[PDB]
Amino acid sequence: NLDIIGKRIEKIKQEHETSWHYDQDHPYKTWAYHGSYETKQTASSMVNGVVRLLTKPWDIIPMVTQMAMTFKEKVDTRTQEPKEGTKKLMKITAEWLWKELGKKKTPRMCTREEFTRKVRSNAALGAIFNKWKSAREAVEDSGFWELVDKERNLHLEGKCETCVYNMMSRAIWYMWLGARFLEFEALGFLNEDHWFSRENSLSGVEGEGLHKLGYILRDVSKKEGGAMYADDTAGWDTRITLEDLKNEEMVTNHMEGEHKKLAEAIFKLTYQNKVVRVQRPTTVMDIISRRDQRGSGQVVTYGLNTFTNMEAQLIRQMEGEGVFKSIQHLTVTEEIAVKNWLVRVGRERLSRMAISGDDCVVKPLDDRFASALTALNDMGKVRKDIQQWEPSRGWNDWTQVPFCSHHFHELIMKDGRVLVVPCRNQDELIGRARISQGAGWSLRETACLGKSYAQMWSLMYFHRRDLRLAANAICSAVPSHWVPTSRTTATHEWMTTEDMLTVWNRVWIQENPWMEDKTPVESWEEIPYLGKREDQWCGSLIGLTSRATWAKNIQTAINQVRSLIGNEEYTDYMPSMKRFRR
């Protein structure tokens, strides 16, 4: 408790000595409260006018238009201690999983040099603005690195002064850039060196890309076994126990020297003991602590969520296969049985899963998995929108399974080759492309963000009639040589000024390991759509009068946007589609 968090608490006390007050009307039950201090401040979603002018039929669809308008009674909940049998299953499984993940990888420190390059090309490293403006400026000033040095030597000493979270089914924990550096130095190797790639982790999909995920689910479907299960956890980050944080820390057992000590300090000082500042309107700033739940950078959060989810799902598979009888307590021979299962079939069981942080698909040996709930519930990974003890409903067809907010279609090209394509309700795709985040967007920057959405649609969603047409329209309306942008950046092959047919060929044919015949496609007309009825089922306006008028008059919409942007060099992409090819 207060010996580890005191210094951080003591330090904040003094910067607001003219405001400190142990409030008695404090709303916290499960967060330990420490004091308050005076503040006053808040970014809402702005509309992308280039995308909206080229998607007029959607201006009257509430599921689209409502997306641009506008649980902290779940951050303040508590998760019970698992039973001794559960704690044992988790420790055995975690020990075994870090060893498998480490067989072909070497833990290593990430560098100031590497950190500097990331900030100078904009990755969402959730930092705060103070002493320097942007992260870009802090990183080119030795003063910063002297602050980093002081904290670093403090961590080697087993103490923390400045690693404090700022809080804002979502809650995002910003830290100052220096704390983010020290987290990246110690734990960045998990993401930088692809520990959760499918090749390395067998269940993982890190780096895979939306054009790969469907093929991966189809490969899992080919295994003998029961239904495919895709149970969502209710508020995964809030259900991470101190026991979970201690099994995650066992990655430090694979480290050495300075690195081992630096990583141990991140886990002890910042993860297993946390200090947070929260805005309360009654506007004060509350300084609260707790030992459990997930609060890390979003990139480390992803890798450790994947790890703990892989562990939880192997244990649920063990329960279904009868490897252990009860979570209350493991006998000695049950320990040897669990160990033996892991050594004997562990890698086969990992290959039966697709796991992306808190999101999973599992194809177990059989449907006993559906009612194997005791370990899952006792670890605190309670399923969303189903009663605690009601058996999971599985999916019989891999094309119906939800994963990473998508489902996947099998689409046969006129030439017989097979594409497995990502899909989601088209209102969600149009509604998201119509939104920009933050202020000070020029017309050119707004146009380049529209172009990023358009090129993503041409690569991932070409099979949706409305999206291939709208993508072609946006790419016709934005100057040909302007570079697609995004202020928050899976693999992003659409972020390029290369011709999109050449990128399509590279992604779907040349580099696609499931495509034996490498014959290039010569035009967009060779590239198929979903069935017309399947397109409607997934939200296509195809067959409406509004959509027919939009399609027929599309050059008029393109010319409206070209007139606003001004006298620039444009390309007409509409004749790449049969109906505008004269």
Ligand SMILES: NC(c1ccccc1)c1ccccc1
């Ligand atoms: N004629 C339309 C239709 C026919 C039958 C069912 C649904 C739409 C149609 C099809 C494909 C593209 C554009 C319009």
Ligand SMILES: [Zn+2]
């Ligand atoms: Zn610190």
Ligand SMILES: [Zn+2]
């Ligand atoms: Zn679909």
